Design an enzyme around this catalytic site. Sequence first.
Site, PDB file in Angstrom:
ATOM      1  N   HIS A  41      53.450  57.019  41.952  1.00 37.11           N
ATOM      2  CA  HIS A  41      51.621  56.632  41.980  1.00 37.11           C
ATOM      3  C   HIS A  41      51.533  57.657  41.369  1.00 37.11           C
ATOM      4  CE1 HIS A  41      52.048  59.275  46.252  1.00 37.11           C
ATOM      5  NE2 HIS A  41      50.517  59.403  45.073  1.00 37.11           N
ATOM      6  N   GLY A 143      45.481  64.872  47.020  1.00 35.32           N
ATOM      7  CA  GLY A 143      46.481  65.880  45.950  1.00 35.32           C
ATOM      8  C   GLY A 143      47.948  66.976  46.138  1.00 35.32           C
ATOM      9  N   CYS A 145      50.298  64.902  47.340  1.00 31.17           N
ATOM     10  CA  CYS A 145      51.578  64.284  47.191  1.00 31.17           C
ATOM     11  C   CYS A 145      52.271  65.539  45.903  1.00 31.17           C
ATOM     12  CB  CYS A 145      51.052  63.036  46.492  1.00 31.17           C
ATOM     13  SG  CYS A 145      50.400  62.461  47.548  1.00 31.17           S
TER      14      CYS A 145
HETATM   15  C1  LIG Z   1      48.069  61.657  47.626  1.00 33.28           C
HETATM   16  C2  LIG Z   1      48.675  61.605  45.764  1.00 33.28           C
HETATM   17  C3  LIG Z   1      47.136  60.737  47.553  1.00 33.28           C
HETATM   18  O1  LIG Z   1      46.350  61.864  48.346  1.00 33.28           O
HETATM   19  N1  LIG Z   1      47.355  60.012  48.569  1.00 33.28           N
HETATM   20  C4  LIG Z   1      48.133  58.973  47.633  1.00 33.28           C
HETATM   21  C5  LIG Z   1      49.074  58.620  47.914  1.00 33.28           C
HETATM   22  C6  LIG Z   1      49.207  57.238  47.540  1.00 33.28           C
HETATM   23  C7  LIG Z   1      49.079  56.174  46.774  1.00 33.28           C
HETATM   24  C8  LIG Z   1      49.119  54.671  46.619  1.00 33.28           C
HETATM   25  C9  LIG Z   1      48.386  54.201  46.995  1.00 33.28           C
HETATM   26  C10 LIG Z   1      49.192  54.731  44.682  1.00 33.28           C
HETATM   27  C11 LIG Z   1      50.778  55.290  46.657  1.00 33.28           C
HETATM   28  C12 LIG Z   1      47.469  56.251  46.482  1.00 33.28           C
HETATM   29  C13 LIG Z   1      47.053  57.993  47.220  1.00 33.28           C
HETATM   30  C14 LIG Z   1      46.388  59.713  50.176  1.00 33.28           C
HETATM   31  C15 LIG Z   1      46.813  58.717  50.767  1.00 33.28           C
HETATM   32  O2  LIG Z   1      48.459  58.019  51.497  1.00 33.28           O
HETATM   33  N2  LIG Z   1      45.841  57.735  50.855  1.00 33.28           N
HETATM   34  C16 LIG Z   1      45.923  56.792  51.829  1.00 33.28           C
HETATM   35  C17 LIG Z   1      47.086  55.352  51.044  1.00 33.28           C
HETATM   36  C18 LIG Z   1      48.296  55.271  51.540  1.00 33.28           C
HETATM   37  O3  LIG Z   1      49.297  56.423  51.679  1.00 33.28           O
HETATM   38  O4  LIG Z   1      48.443  54.368  51.513  1.00 33.28           O
HETATM   39  C19 LIG Z   1      49.961  53.427  52.468  1.00 33.28           C
HETATM   40  C20 LIG Z   1      49.599  52.960  53.509  1.00 33.28           C
HETATM   41  C21 LIG Z   1      47.186  61.049  50.665  1.00 33.28           C
HETATM   42  C22 LIG Z   1      46.109  61.683  51.232  1.00 33.28           C
HETATM   43  C23 LIG Z   1      46.566  62.882  52.355  1.00 33.28           C
HETATM   44  C24 LIG Z   1      47.595  63.154  52.609  1.00 33.28           C
HETATM   45  N3  LIG Z   1      48.626  62.582  51.749  1.00 33.28           N
HETATM   46  C25 LIG Z   1      48.042  61.439  50.989  1.00 33.28           C
END
Ligand SMILES: *[C@@H](C)C(=O)N(c1ccc(C(C)(C)C)cc1)[C@@H](C(=O)NCCC(=O)OCC)c1cccnc1
Lengths: 304, 304
Positions: A41, A143, A145
């Site tokens: 991602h 961040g 990830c």
């Molecule tokens: C970590 C890369 C990040 O900041 N994200 C994140 C992960 C995955 C995506 C994706 C939707 C493109 C696959 C985008 C951003 C945070 C995150 O998980 N955001 C919420 C989106 C999500 O996981 O939706 C699935 C239900 C993140 C925030 C805090 C801790 N870990 C990750």
Amino acid sequence: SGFRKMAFPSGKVEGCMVQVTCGTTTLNGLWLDDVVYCPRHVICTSEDMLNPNYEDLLIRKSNHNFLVQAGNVQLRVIGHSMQNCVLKLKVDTANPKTPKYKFVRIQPGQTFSVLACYNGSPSGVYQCAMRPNFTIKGSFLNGSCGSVGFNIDYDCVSFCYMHHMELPTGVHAGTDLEGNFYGPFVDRQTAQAAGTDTTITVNVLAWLYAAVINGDRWFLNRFTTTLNDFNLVAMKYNYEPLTQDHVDILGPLSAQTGIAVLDMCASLKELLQNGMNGRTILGSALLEDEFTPFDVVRQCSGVT
Amino acid sequence: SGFRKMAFPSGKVEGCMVQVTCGTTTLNGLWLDDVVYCPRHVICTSEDMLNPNYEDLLIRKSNHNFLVQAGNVQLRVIGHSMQNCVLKLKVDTANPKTPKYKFVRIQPGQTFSVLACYNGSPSGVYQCAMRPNFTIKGSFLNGSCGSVGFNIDYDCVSFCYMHHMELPTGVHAGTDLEGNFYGPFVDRQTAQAAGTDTTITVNVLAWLYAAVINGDRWFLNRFTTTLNDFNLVAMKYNYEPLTQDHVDILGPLSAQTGIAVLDMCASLKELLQNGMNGRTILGSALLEDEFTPFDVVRQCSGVT
Ligand SMILES: *[C@@H](C)C(=O)N(c1ccc(C(C)(C)C)cc1)[C@@H](C(=O)NCCC(=O)OCC)c1cccnc1
Ligand SMILES: *[C@@H](C)C(=O)N(c1ccc(C(C)(C)C)cc1)[C@@H](C(=O)NCCC(=O)OCC)c1cccnc1
């Protein structure tokens, strides 16, 4: 004496953390040999978080679009490929700090340490467990990830987890180092509810043995039980069923303390039915389930 | 999101751990520049644990009697001296992995990470707090002496603790890196009872702010209190008195959550008076006091 939620020394893994940037997204990568592993991602923008087509998004990316930085120096990307939900970025330089390593896929109930990183830099280390619903209760901000979970056997790091996402319930989902998610989770911004977070019974028993070894014995009762009787109580309390394999794995702890596994099950049964009554076990007011029998033995023997 | 008992990445400290042997006693040493620091009780035998005269015992020791091993290679000892309860062994080689460092003497309530070691090898890392009675609730077995406590500010390691002993109550006592014990403890096998282990009130409030930031809000009430009213309740429950300095230090957390410090004190007051009622806060059934306001900010902001 004393019993702590202990993580592995993180040094060997710190030497592998790099920053990966693709477009405007920056996350962490794991640099082992001449390959940098990171969540796929990293190629996703804002306009396509809901339903990304990773193969299609990847066609628009070339080696030069993945910016890999180790410390304050840039790595040259000479190849890229997608394996399941991870990207493998071949760099022209083997990581000089690559420890002996393996990629393992752990089972629910198994514990590991997480080196939380931001911008390829380590911020902290903590001990986790793969929950029975295949989530982890981590501490991860935006961040984080690409931060990884691992176990260490003397000088060999077994990487078991790579952080990918946070579910709407604040629990975490990720993959093994082959890119396969633990559980049914997918790397897209969609409704993904976690299943029942049951208690890892074998781990609780291991931690009760650790408490006895460390002098906390108030919960030891005059009772015994059977695997079937205990399991009726375990089901009632959303505890995982205890199997004969679990009883066997607890054998060394049973031997060290002289307390039969089924007697400890009966103590656990009374703790479930009567509560702690305001008392604590190893400084905790609840039954801890993120220590495996192996962790209890390791900590109580001083494995380095 | 998510909140974990997080330790600093231990890599910088792993690179400093050495094994020190004197006679038949082997413990850990900290190698910074050309000096190896270790507990002075490495010179003690079995026949003199009760009342050692360290100056007298040290007269019988020469440089060649202190065996220092870093990895699988032996360091040459060219000098030795006793500073309070630590020995400083001058070696002929500066540690090539010496990070930027400071020696600090922490106050009670302050937290730090411990890299538990055996035979100069790291076994695990965990987060501790200097208790108000100057003990630490660590996880240390025989041979763990010389393991150190530290904090990290970007690339500078501030060493604050060196493990020396376990009291008959299973709690731990140690020194700063100048060899001065925290508290009234002495390095001899004698009756040393710890004082009241009061709860670090400012840390509990910091952790309640962390809970609000992470979505755990059930304990937030409609009440407020004053510092004097809160402190009457804190005294009753063996909580440390809260000062205006503590209120000031909690200011950034109060600002981020919009919850006045004295309102959080009133929530804490009701939690003390009514209990948790079987509920949990950040996965804990008791009020956690081993997170400082600084740790909460650091973890919730992602400082690397
Ligand atoms: C970590 C890369 C990040 O900041 N994200 C994140 C992960 C995955 C995506 C994706 C939707 C493109 C696959 C985008 C951003 C945070 C995150 O998980 N955001 C919420 C989106 C999500 O996981 O939706 C699935 C239900 C993140 C925030 C805090 C801790 N870990 C990750
Ligand atoms: C660590 C070096 C060790 O194994 N000891 C230890 C510390 C100090 C002495 C000393 C009496 C010569 C100063 C001897 C051995 C353990 C320990 O503390 N033993 C009990 C003696 C003691 O502390 O008496 C004071 C009341 C130790 C075991 C487990 C964890 N840490 C230390």
